[PDB]
Design a protein around this ligand. Structure first.
Ligand code: THF
Ligand code: PLG
Ligand code: PLG
Ligand code: PLG
Ligand code: PLG
Lengths: 478, 478, 478, 478
């Protein structure tokens, strides 16, 4: 009677302004339990990191409500005056952050994430069944770089395109550029990918470029893992030799989840005596493949977040962070080698390293699970071999996460020891049941048991105590 | 003493905890300018809406920092104990919200958005060059349902798959199920799509299902535009006849941007031959196509947001909101018909309506631009009887956005008049110029190029005054 | 160097000059047994005919020994001076025989046969997965026009390309050009095929052409069955509206087995007011498809045979033969209708007719077998809306074969009666068992057991006596 | 029809029985001019040969008139009782000739020619876009073993399938089986091809088979060039290791133009702990591929010819001919090496050899043309190493043709000298021309230069006189 459905319309009213803390206590609980986990634990996962409060604060903005399907050129909707400001600002900051002359480069900040950015480029430049060459998955390449096997096609890339990988010399762990140049002549790639998910050395963009032009193919760099190191100038930039560069904005770049596609324009090629010229049409093809080719409406709130992180990436505080990141890696790789473990290719040139546990009877699958039980998060990355995912032989460690929390060399050494203690434990428990049972049973004396869990319980504690003593970027604990 | 270095580390320290308001004033400015826009304006874009504070508050959580590439049970990284809680909770709430027996249904809450969800299904069930049938784009169907022309394939869908559309009787605006059944026999679709972006009537899932089984194809519903109306029970659910149902979580569902894939699981095909069964393998194929097939790591923070919105969708305050949404549509469609405009199919069964401005000499392209200048977000739309695309003959209006702000019938009538005044103005300004006038020229004379901007300026005001008097869901003050 | 350079080399010497009669008595026997069969029997198979002695005489020439892989332009071999004469002469006579201006038309006389010629064109103009539209198989089309299923893609055409058929109004048996125009707009064919293997009426090339240009597709005619009637001028030529015309050189053209591809050239269309003239590139694409595309070295001996038959086709003796061929058809269709049988579309406009035995309880499968047992050649073709094959309700009869042997109207009437007697017999042998008995139950109980193979034996005789009284073209008894 | 037309019926009557000599004097003239050419000339083209009279005599039989679309025991026409005899007899003789147990092997004698046979197998076993590995064209491979530039795919094989070649050590001219095994692991071929058009050594079927099974692919042998040598037993048979063997029936088999597809059958499975018994399915797939898949109606007259040649291949006169063929090769390769020319791989194991004219400043292109002018059928062919491609470096010589005419060692030496004299002449006409070659220029001078055509005229004579002194298989003066 209080003007109809009075009661409910009042509720529905509050429900849309009520805080998460009240609206959904269950989801609220989980988020805090997770925030906590990240605080009292050692994140050594190469691809993870902690986003600044500034970035996150933009993710939950009103931008999440606007549809702007086109481009700052022609949109399929109205009221994009501000979204247009935002999009162009981010595009501007993107080219800046990587010291790119807007006359020769352009960007697309609409890819929902990394994988999407890549598929978008193959779609634009390779076309259905077109040939692509990438670094084999177990050799350091990425799923989206064309990943298949003798029997199954795992990646969408190898499904809609024809892929063939190149390898690393098992002997030294370095990319075998000689075999690549050889095979490229027989396969005729239409695009070659220079990017990795687990390679601790720099890429010879120079030589790759040569091979690419030799077979008249595009050279695309997927600098996802080093987007930050590159923007900071601490490592060699792929923008000197590649025609296209894709990337995620999280990881070493410390932004929110998204992807970008950098592409060359105009000044393509020059003819000697034949003095005729050729141009780049990348901008046209790529922008279209993204939309309406593959995506719907851009996620303006994510783009806002990226713009924020891009700005931060241009600071000196950033350039120094990234430097510490590299330094910390050496520290950890040295202390670890010193402790007597095998580090592929000897060491690292970037932010990650790969351990070959093989020279210890233990595999990466077991070791990974133990370290987890002790608040030490990482990857059971695949080794330069032919075994297979889910039960590898090496571990992948990264430093961006922890460096962002303060940790310096001395601390990373203490970390090294914690890890040593962990594998130490793994070897023990291995024999305390010495048989032919797989991981699924390993979860037993681990999960259940108790006497074995008294060891972990101790180490986990010393670790969590060590961890909790550092800062944790983000909101007011949430 | 140790200034030199530790002096900076103090900055980098604050930079990661400093509020957006300080960190990036530029981006902060834009966000507020945009928040404002949404406040003092009439959002009539069928696919837009305002997300609750609860949802948004979850988007900028720590979840944005975790990598969990696999699925609960077997992930590729560790420390997913909580992400697992979250993911399973959301999957649980998803099946609940749509009253689905977890014995016969399953979900995937990892698709980054709507389009991605769909491509994932075609990838899983159709396979390269497989045949797909959808509602032609200009007939109310959506881009990803297959869209191609005489020379160029547009939607990634028609690029990697072989598509052919079905139509609506131009005479009445209803889907011509008879022609569909006819063509399906000659084309042999492998999957048929029942979903729209601009159709004001319910779909005959029952008949579509018949046609699907007749040709032994899958029936997939893309209930993006009606996800909310369906969850609320106000309209017929596609879950009774479809094998698979995909959807966006924004729009009538009022959540954050993302997508979901619902699929049947269990036994299909009694096999009146012998005591032999036949099962559904959708879960297996779809889950794999999503990952490692097409996507990288799930965006856990978006999933959190979805879970929050799902909960809200199950409330009575929601069921009532959705009811008002429908009611408001009729009101607007009546007041508009009453004013003498043509509404395709006569009216609406859902939350949107399509105006045929053709019976007024003006097209949707011009009219859309004028209404924008008056703080009335529209959206032009292709339609029955010729398709110019981007320069259609109709306007698409929706009510979810404004209903979420309070607006009731009386208010939507006042809205109708505002719109009438707008097209009124368009007709005027048209007449007063060259009969060989371009749209870009129209856009000129509309610019500050007249006493006509004095007309718009007046209407814009009366509109913004009317608007600003209603609530606007979201974050109180950043 | 003993019984070698004496014995073995003398034998090997003779073996290569020794006549077939001695060299291989087995094969020699079979050939004569077959020559005989053709003499004492009524060949009513629409696609068969008897080649002149002149033609055959060239098939076994020395030409069978030369390799000339390229074209008269440039080959890849030497000593093609004469093969070049031959090839160009044949190409010359081909354009003459069909009154084609060499300025607008060109030919390729290298296709090994009919099917090859077609695939060659699709390969050249359609490209992998390109769309093609043809007359459904059971509606009157040929496998090469693409033939698939909801279960499997059968023909090579529907395997490497994307095909969709058009139909005939089951009610009248005429091609439903209205539905074709309708579907072509939704499917977007890249090429449309106008040709049949079992249609007794002329094709509306004029309207087909309209539809093709409407969707900007190529119109290809496969005049295999009417190559002769067309060259002779007795029926409408497809060369007036089609862009490409393929054909077999046997059947109504009475040559040896092979195929040809006729294509347009020079000025495809001039822009409205822009001097820019679009040109025909068919010659280039097609010639390359044949070689080095799909074929190896041309079969020069077959080409020689074709050249001979082409010359004969331009005679008056030919023009008259073809006239009698048509006449004879009417005669047979009339006498047959008169006898009370159903002839699809009422009659014929060409050299063949299709009987609907359905209105007699018997199917084409049974009837065909009976008539065979009586030295009468058939084709149990399907019929308009046959409720499935396996039980085709029709028989396909042609007159070119027998007309070439002398037979005139009076004789074809006597033929009609022989046929009547045959089906008559079928019904009988069918009438007593007349149950769900399979065609195999009939197949057997027929010639199988019941000693009334005494009935067939009688009819077979009266037929063979009637037959053996006519001439039989060819070589002096082979 | 009265007296009006009936006259001509007498002509039309004769026209069909009149001899080619009268019917078409033009074509008759050409055939004799060509028969002559072959008589007074040295045919050194590796892929050519002269067919026996027995074979040719069957080509122009009545069989050219019958349609028998299906297979024996499953046709779609009637009156195939004799065609069935013929087809089965040929299939029988095929398995005999190669000492194949009909329990483990089967054949298809319907492929119109070599290329067709191959495409048929890829179509049946590889399927669209399936991967295939063959010997690179310039290293000794054939056009249908795949061939594609980096700008476009030439052979139909590389167009409808995904191909990648393997090579020969340019240093020694032998196939690099080590690289093949290497690449096969990275490419995952679905089928590997073991066959050549220009390789003078035997193939390691044994090793190839290993590699094939390693990657679980089919090993197909294309023994076109050695079909005869193999049937005769003079060289190693591929039937010991390959799953499928295709071939042409002309060339080293001295039959008429056609092809055959040999395939394994019955069992070849059983593994687990339970006797599997998976059997081969090649017969099923291949036979269907050929029909209704790719071909129309078989060319029964060609099949007859093949059957005749198969019989002849099983004689001792044949086994001896083939032995002489091999012997003659050595003779020619020795006399040629002796004269100081380079023979790739040193010599030959079969019927052909490849000359590397590179070590003489002259290329195969020029040399070929000169030798032609002197009644010597040669053939340029790139050899391992030269980037050239357009500037060959080699000549391919074969002995089957001339051996079939009687020629023995002594004669082949005289031949060697004639060739020497020829290249000798080439150098001359070439060692006095600018420097920036251009064969466009060489072939120019070649014709007009008196001195030069007086030289050729002399050699041509001595050659033609030498030639005309030998027998020439085939019908009398045809
Ligand atoms: N009924 C409807 N269907 C839709 O999919 C659609 C619509 N409403 N509402 C607005 C948006 C965006 N609409 C679009 C419509 C067409 C093109 C498009 O194909 N553009 C062409 C232009 C050239 C031409 O017309 O030939 C291109 O080539 O890019 C893109 C987006 N949208 C919901 O996604
Ligand atoms: C024969 N071509 C050899 C040449 O150089 O002429 C051949 C064939 C099939 O040829 P075809 O002309 O009958 O179609 C197939 N495969 C191989 C290896 C060769 O050598
Ligand atoms: C000829 N087949 C007619 C029949 O009755 O079977 C034909 C062909 C080519 O056949 P081919 O055997 O030489 O390859 C191609 N296209 C058409 C329309 C017909 O009729
Ligand atoms: C039926 C349907 N399916 C999928 C999508 C995918 O959109 P997103 O990529 O944004 O997530 C939309 C979007 N429709 C938006 C509109 O009509 O305006 C839709 O309407
Ligand atoms: C080189 C490279 N490129 C693109 C991606 C795309 O990922 P996303 O879809 O998640 O956004 C990754 C993922 N790298 C993640 C890891 O190795 O842990 C990568 O390593």
């Amino acid at each position: 009677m209080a003007d109809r459905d009075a009661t409910l319309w009042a509720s529905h009213e509050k429900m849309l302004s009520q805080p998460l803390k009240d609206s959904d206590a269950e989801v609220y609980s989980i988020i805090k339990k997770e925030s906590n986990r990240q605080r009292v634990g050692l994140e050594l996962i190469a691809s993870e990191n902690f986003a600044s409060r500034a970035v996150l604060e933009a993710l939950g903005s009103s931008l999440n409500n606007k549809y702007s399907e086109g481009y700052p050129g022609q949109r399929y909707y109205g009221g994009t005056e501000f979204i247009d400001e935002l999009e162009m600002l981010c595009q501007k900051r993107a080219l800046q952050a990587y010291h790119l002359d807007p006359q020769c480069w352009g960007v697309n900040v609409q890819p929902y994430s990394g994988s999407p950015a890549n598929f978008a480029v193959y779609t634009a430049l390779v076309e259905p069944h077109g040939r692509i060459m990438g670094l084999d998955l177990p050799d350091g390449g990425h799923l989206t770089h064309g990943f298949m096997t003798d029997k199954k096609k795992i990646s969408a890339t190898s499904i809609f395109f024809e892929s063939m990988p190149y390898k690393v010399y098992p002997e030294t762990g370095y990319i075998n550029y000689d075999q690549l140049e050889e095979n490229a002549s027989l396969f005729h790639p239409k695009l070659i990918i220079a990017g990795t998910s687990c390679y601790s050395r720099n890429l010879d963009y120079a030589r790759l470029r040569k091979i690419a032009d030799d077979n008249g193919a595009y050279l695309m760099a997927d600098m996802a893992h080093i987007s930050g190191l590159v923007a900071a100038g601490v490592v060699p930039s792929p923008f000197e030799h590649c025609h296209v560069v894709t990337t995620t904005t999280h990881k070493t770049l410390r932004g929110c989840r998204a992807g970008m596609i950098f592409y060359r324009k105009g000044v393509r090629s020059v003819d000697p005596k034949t003095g005729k010229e050729t141009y780049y049409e990348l901008e046209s093809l790529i922008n279209s493949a993204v939309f309406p080719g593959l995506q719907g409406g851009p996620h303006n709130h994510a783009i806002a977040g990226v713009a924020v992180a891009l700005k931060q990436a241009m600071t000196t505080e950033f350039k120094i962070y990234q430097l510490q990141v590299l330094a910390n890696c050496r520290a950890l790789s040295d202390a670890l080698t010193e402790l007597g473990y095998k580090i592929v290719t000897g060491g690292s040139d970037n932010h990650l390293i790969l351990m070959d546990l093989r020279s210890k009877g233990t595999d990466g699958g077991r070791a990974e699970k133990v370290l987890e039980a002790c608040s030490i998060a990482c990857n059971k990355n695949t080794c330069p071999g032919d075994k297979s995912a889910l039960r590898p032989s090496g571990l992948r460690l990264g430093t961006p996460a922890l460096t962002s929390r303060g940790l310096l060399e001395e601390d990373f050494q203490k970390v090294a020891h914690f890890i040593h203690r962990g594998i130490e434990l793994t070897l023990q428990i291995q024999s305390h049941m010495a048989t032919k049972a797989t991981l699924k049973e390993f979860k037993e004396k681990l999960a259940g048991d108790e006497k074995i869990q008294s060891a972990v319980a101790t180490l986990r504690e010393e670790v969590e105590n060590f961890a909790s003593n550092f800062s944790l970027p983000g909101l007011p604990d949430f």
